[PDB]
Design a protein around this ligand. Structure first.
Ligand SMILES: Cc1cc2nc3c(=O)[nH]c(=O)nc-3n(C[C@H](O)[C@H](O)[C@H](O)COP(=O)(O)OP(=O)(O)OC[C@H]3O[C@@H](n4cnc5c(N)ncnc54)[C@H](O)[C@@H]3O)c2cc1C
Ligand SMILES: Cc1cc2nc3c(=O)[nH]c(=O)nc-3n(C[C@H](O)[C@H](O)[C@H](O)COP(=O)(O)OP(=O)(O)OC[C@H]3O[C@@H](n4cnc5c(N)ncnc54)[C@H](O)[C@@H]3O)c2cc1C
Ligand SMILES: Cc1cc2nc3c(=O)[nH]c(=O)nc-3n(C[C@H](O)[C@H](O)[C@H](O)COP(=O)(O)OP(=O)(O)OC[C@H]3O[C@@H](n4cnc5c(N)ncnc54)[C@H](O)[C@@H]3O)c2cc1C
Ligand SMILES: Cc1cc2nc3c(=O)[nH]c(=O)nc-3n(C[C@H](O)[C@H](O)[C@H](O)COP(=O)(O)OP(=O)(O)OC[C@H]3O[C@@H](n4cnc5c(N)ncnc54)[C@H](O)[C@@H]3O)c2cc1C
Ligand SMILES: O=C(CO)[C@@H](O)[C@H](O)CO
Ligand SMILES: O=C(CO)[C@@H](O)[C@H](O)CO
Ligand SMILES: O=C(CO)[C@@H](O)[C@H](O)CO
Ligand SMILES: O=C(CO)[C@@H](O)[C@H](O)CO
Lengths: 412, 411, 399, 405
């Protein structure tokens, strides 16, 4: 019926839940208009369609680990929670995960979903091949090794190349992670010490309510002195939640307690499992150089942000070569905004935000809200012409192109 | 707002999600009318209230394992999926789980939730102590060792004693379980071999559509073959109890050994339905009336199968818990996962109840039924005892909604 | 003390007439205890150093329309404070039995009325200003000091001398009050909850002679006990036999202003129990009614809502109040209380801090979850133990 | 989001763009607080509101000409760029145009926007009637002919009467205009020859950087040479490209591709602040010299200043109410803090010349004094209360400056 938040009521005629590869290939082939439905953790109409919603949650939850190549072959309908548990048990890990694990692996990689860390990509960077059902109904495989020229536009694809059934991931050895929350770092500390703070851990989040002159929280996640303590931030005495009033229970165990990578790198614990959300979201991704400038630009309109914000989160993400990846050929600073659920009021505040950041050539998070018109947005991605070439090659009728992918990427 | 099936719209004024014991104690105390809210996997008006709905999902998720006594202190908002995973990690298990893990431990035990298994009781049986917030707002502990007279009425409580915050669970060593599905057993094979079948593994499920003369599926889970010999054929790939639904949802089959918490339920940890498209009722009968009852239903299989997804038949050992459906009688379980027409199932239930009447059938407290109070109560010895415990720990009836008033507490 | 069973062993009795003067006295005196009205019955207000009244201070009463709160002199009595609050068209939720009781003295001990959804008077407090042992002002408020403010109000005057308390107000309201005579004692076994909920504030008066509740006072904001066999009173009544009805607030259902209705207007003990033990307790007490009734004027049963104030008797549990206005024979009463505390022990009872009791410390401290937090707040605000007498040392602070 | 400059961040709740009169009238009637948004070419908080910002650029762009009366009925949301090009096509013209065409007609007229020329008023004088949606949502027409007592209040209104949908303009025959730039006139030239200079063309503009005592540039626009006695494409600001500006070097062209300084195609956000003071024309030289005396404080934080002339009108809050006028315009550099210092000073040195500020550009002139400098303000306050008792269309700006006691 709706997206996780419940602001997007899907206008689809039918919701198909194929129980096999064969049953999917039939649904895709016979349907004139398809958009794959993963986890519903998007806030825009990217997943909307007047035709066929198709889930892949009901296919085999394959997770075949090849010990020789250190790579897992895994079902696109599978979520990061499950995938991680299974990978971890077998003694394998991924380099990073998003804020909660209950997010669909293909759905995440489609929109350029990311964690934080200076030397760590968006999650799609771990992908080394896809198999997808084309608009026709047959399996195509695109892999880095085999298809150098085409693979990089395959992964962060807005699910407009077809339905991905199995993604190959490069694995690392399973690892332990400790996480501490520091409170009330002074905002001015960023002006001279931004690079030192975000490098002070494997993955660092800044949380600010854009009220006053203080970074409300700083989450410093280390692979097994703290810099942000030196700079005025006090360690938190107990468990904490990024948002004011929301329970610490939900969140991954903090207070410096080492635990497995997959119960630490996300902000939310394997158990949390919210059936629904009461928030909106927008995230702008800038070149890393514009962090401070951009911080200040936003400091200038904090009086419009703070009223309708739950929390804003600031992260770093290494550059990839993935054509519609927000991290395409530029190390990045992430300006995320978990809003309160008033779309009208957030839409005003986003047009404004987009004006004050415009000098920093900001790319919006494909899954989160934005108002950046196509002309401007397309100019901010070099390889947008090469991706439109691949979408017409693999989907000439534009089966997998709803209004959103047309408007933002495909239409002239 | 609603139950997981969505047939029950809670008519509550407030939905509290306290983040601390203190915050809970304040909400309980100040609210003149409370019903706790766990996982929402009930289908009747048990969890409904005009007063204050109260989750405990927001309290610290304690799983404190005490190696010495081999027990686990666990938060009442926690669900079996999370609890199990954590218990398994530390190298511990429980004896049984329900069909899907993502059910709340306090809400499961509060209704008499159960698996299958000859020598295995309802899940509430692994409970040795409960700490709860009284209608007053203070903590009370009831344990088997400290309160032998009263503890047996406190676990399977319909949440009418107050809000349980922690539950002590006797553990076992973590164990491996293999699972095999068998297809199209002859219905007559039960008549002389029911007990031989249900005992053919640690936990055993019979799934029939109540169409014609076959048992669609038989699931035989073993701690690390009868029904083959009796004319059922091994399934060659993965399978789901209901026709149409995907095998993918379900725990790994084909006799492949796995961890207990990834086998004893039908549904794998990853399957996480946010909503359901079904109703439910389950009748629990003394084991001797298995065949007698099997036939008595077969006599109205023409009114069942129309509005039915699948019916599940299981065994449950006896316990001593006053409102447990397995209260001092080894049990045969007749489960019905209906299709979501409440008006139509209610009519089929009136009937089911009438034909099963001679077997003194106790309904599952969480699932649908229409068995009136007078009759329901007479099927429970220790109903007068529970009514006293409620009055002792909740004189004002704070935790007594119209459901618990009408079925157990009112005269 | 207003009873006269406690002779204050203080060297000096100061009555500062200015904040400045009070601040001086506190600073210069190495041992202080504040004196309200003297409506305690125990050794709580007693000290060998300096008694300090605050009755002479400016009776400030600053009603802030916006937040709907008042700022009032700790020395002010509820009678006086009420009259002023009422004239401005404001009220407090509840008042104790007589208004001529000091506001900071009341809140320090866990003073309370009756009412199912009504707290002790200390719950109406949002902030305190108090002179420390050093002579400077500290403000503790709920808003500004979440962690600490709950130890501060019901304090046993062991943190400093409170000068001004901020109260949350309601709109001023009328109240009617009817006394019913001779309810059957059995009527509580099934209808306790229904009776105590039959008004805004309800009181049960029993002489613990036979099986009758002598009187039941039912106070309503502008019904069960009539139907359960108690008869309406023909004319004005007083809770104690023989004492004149003239002393008591107007009854016979004549609507009146809250402050002329919620109060009713000897030694005293009160035990405060989880509300669920109301009937169980009421029997345990009937089971020694032969030792009570001889030395008793009247006993008063009331209900009080839970709060989060660390040494409130209502700390984290709705409450049934069992009060005993005794005949002034302390030696006799101390025998009765020792037995009473034994029969009531299973109901984990808390004593009214400002009334008599013999519950040993080790036990009394285990019936308060947040004693250690209150002990660390007194050592934070008064490390010298200026405001620590023998009472507060014995019961709460000493190790 | 912001005004064209970006110094004003709109603190509105809703930004509406009605696509019909019906839809506007609905937005107005249901909104308790409204301010219309034109082109955002203001620099103060005149357009600002905590209520409802309402563009009109999405209504029918009507341009209904009556050959008989030689008058056009035009959509308020229309810009001078568009409106001109369509007026011209039909073989009609307006007497004058502001510096660029991409300013909203009703936005222009609401603040008393103007060009240069001795015998031509501010743009608002060409308006003979308005239809506006009241705070109730119904249409009211005020016209000079029908409502003599009230109409003069209605045009230069500060958008405080209602939302103007259609304005009736008096038109002329379409005319050609040539313009020429002369460079470095001596400032002393003005001392005896100001009047002769500003009368030397249809419109004349004097650009000075307020460095020394020269006029950097004199733009002389003639319908189809005095400043020569006392020649150059060129941009009024140092460092900005000439290509942005209308075609000069005496090349004849249509009025609308000429009278503005900036060509139909430019279409730029901005990087400047603005103030303009409008003095009775006789104080030209006295004021020019009074400013030359603090030209040390000005020239630093200045792009360019423009001095122009404007005819008198009878429009109640027109800067040109009952007096021929000399315009001292300043395009400042974007440092509001620095400019607000210079304006307190400028407003003191010009005080004897009874200056009126441009309603659309910056000023620090206190209300009591500003109000004294308009005779008819008492009558505009009586009209606003007549058309908008609840003050739906009155923001902080209009209340502070004009309406509040
Ligand atoms: C609570 C929450 C936390 C979040 N945390 C983070 C975070 O920390 N970092 C971050 O970067 N983002 C984060 N996000 C954003 C989120 O990762 C994106 O919205 C994500 O891309 C949505 O994935 P989905 O599958 O849930 O959503 P959907 O709307 O269901 O799908 C997203 C897109 O993927 C496509 N897709 C899905 N499955 C397939 C498939 N098999 N083949 C092809 N295309 C497919 C769909 O067509 C659609 O276009 C968060 C979102 C939420 C709600
Ligand atoms: C998909 C599905 C699968 C199922 N599988 C099985 C199965 O295999 N076997 C079986 O026997 N049953 C099964 N059931 C039935 C189910 O276990 C019961 O309805 C059970 O009561 C679920 O409780 P809940 O907390 O999830 O729901 P709720 O309606 O929220 O809670 C049930 C009761 O528990 C009480 N409660 C919850 N938390 C507390 C607490 N902390 N303190 C006090 N009271 C509390 C509530 O007040 C309420 O009265 C299943 C149900 C579904 C929907
Ligand atoms: C006739 C009568 C009726 C009563 N009715 C009730 C009733 O209905 N309900 C009930 O609960 N109790 C009742 N009580 C008990 C009485 O209200 C309490 O004992 C109360 O706490 C005493 O207040 P006081 O002004 O007499 O203080 P005192 O006995 O003089 O002092 C008691 C405490 O107050 C402290 N104190 C006083 N002022 C300050 C200050 N400004 N700053 C710091 N500490 C201060 C002292 O330090 C001391 O610890 C009654 C008592 C009597 C005599
Ligand atoms: C680059 C530039 C050049 C300029 N050149 C000149 C110039 O040469 N001469 C000159 O005199 N001024 C000039 N100005 C100033 C400008 O002409 C005035 O500030 C003008 O009033 C603003 O027009 P706008 O449409 O941007 O108004 P806005 O800022 O959008 O709003 C201004 C006022 O118009 C009102 N309004 C707009 N439309 C309506 C309507 N339909 N009904 C009712 N009220 C309405 C608004 O409520 C507000 O009170 C210039 C400004 C800039 C930025
Ligand atoms: O990263 C995200 C969402 O993309 C979350 O951390 C939010 O910041 C809310 O906590
Ligand atoms: O039998 C049960 C227990 O309630 C179900 O979970 C089965 O899968 C039938 O749907
Ligand atoms: O309120 C009290 C004391 O708390 C009553 O006992 C009255 O004094 C009547 O005796
Ligand atoms: O905008 C105006 C008038 O308001 C012009 O003076 C420009 O500054 C020319 O550069």
């Amino acid at each position: 019926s709706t997206n996780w938040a419940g602001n997007v009521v899907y206008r689809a005629s039918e919701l198909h839940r194929p129980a096999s590869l064969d049953e999917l290939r039939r649904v895709v082939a016979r349907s004139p208009k398809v958009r794959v439905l993963g986890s519903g953790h998007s806030f825009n109409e990217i997943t909307d369609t007047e035709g066929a919603l198709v889930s892949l949650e009901a296919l085999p939850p394959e997770v075949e680990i090849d010990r020789a190549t250190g790579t897992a072959r895994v079902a696109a309908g599978l979520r990061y929670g499950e995938l991680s548990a299974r990978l971890h048990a077998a003694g394998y890990a991924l380099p990073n995960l998003a804020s909660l694990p209950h997010i669909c692996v293909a759905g995440a990689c489609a929109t350029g979903t990311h964690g934080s860390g200076d030397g760590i990509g968006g999650l799609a960077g771990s992908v080394t091949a896809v198999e997808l059902v084309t608009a026709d109904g047959d399996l195509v495989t695109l892999s880095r090794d085999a298809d150098p020229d085409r693979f990089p536009g395959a992964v962060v694809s807005l699910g407009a190349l077809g339905a991905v059934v199995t993604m190959t991931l490069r694995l690392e050895p399973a690892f332990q992670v400790r996480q501490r929350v520091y409170e009330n770092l002074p905002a001015e500390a960023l002006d001279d010490h931004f690079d030192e703070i975000m490098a002070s851990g494997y993955s660092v989040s800044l949380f600010t309510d854009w009220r006053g002159d203080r970074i409300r929280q700083v989450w410093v996640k280390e692979r097994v002195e703290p810099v942000v303590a030196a700079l005025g931030a006090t360690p938190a005495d107990g468990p904490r939640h990024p948002v004011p009033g929301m329970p610490a229970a939900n969140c991954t165990e903090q207070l410096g307690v080492p635990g497995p990578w997959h119960e630490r790198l996300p902000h939310f614990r394997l158990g949390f499992t919210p059936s629904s959300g009461d928030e909106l979201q927008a995230e702008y991704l800038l070149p890393r150089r514009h962090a401070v400038a951009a911080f200040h630009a936003l400091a200038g309109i904090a009086d419009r942000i703070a009223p309708v914000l739950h929390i804003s989160e600031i992260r770093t993400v290494a550059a990839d070569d993935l054509w519609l990846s927000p991290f395409h050929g530029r190390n990045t600073v992430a300006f995320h905004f978990t809003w309160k659920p008033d779309e009208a009021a957030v839409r005003e505040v986003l047009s404004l935000m987009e004006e004050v950041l415009a000098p920093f050539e900001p790319r919006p998070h494909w899954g989160k809200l934005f108002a950046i018109p196509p002309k401007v947005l397309r100019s901010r991605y070099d390889r947008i012409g090469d991706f439109r070439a691949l979408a017409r090659e693999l989907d000439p009728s534009g089966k997998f192109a709803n209004a959103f992918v047309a408007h933002h990427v495909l239409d002239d």
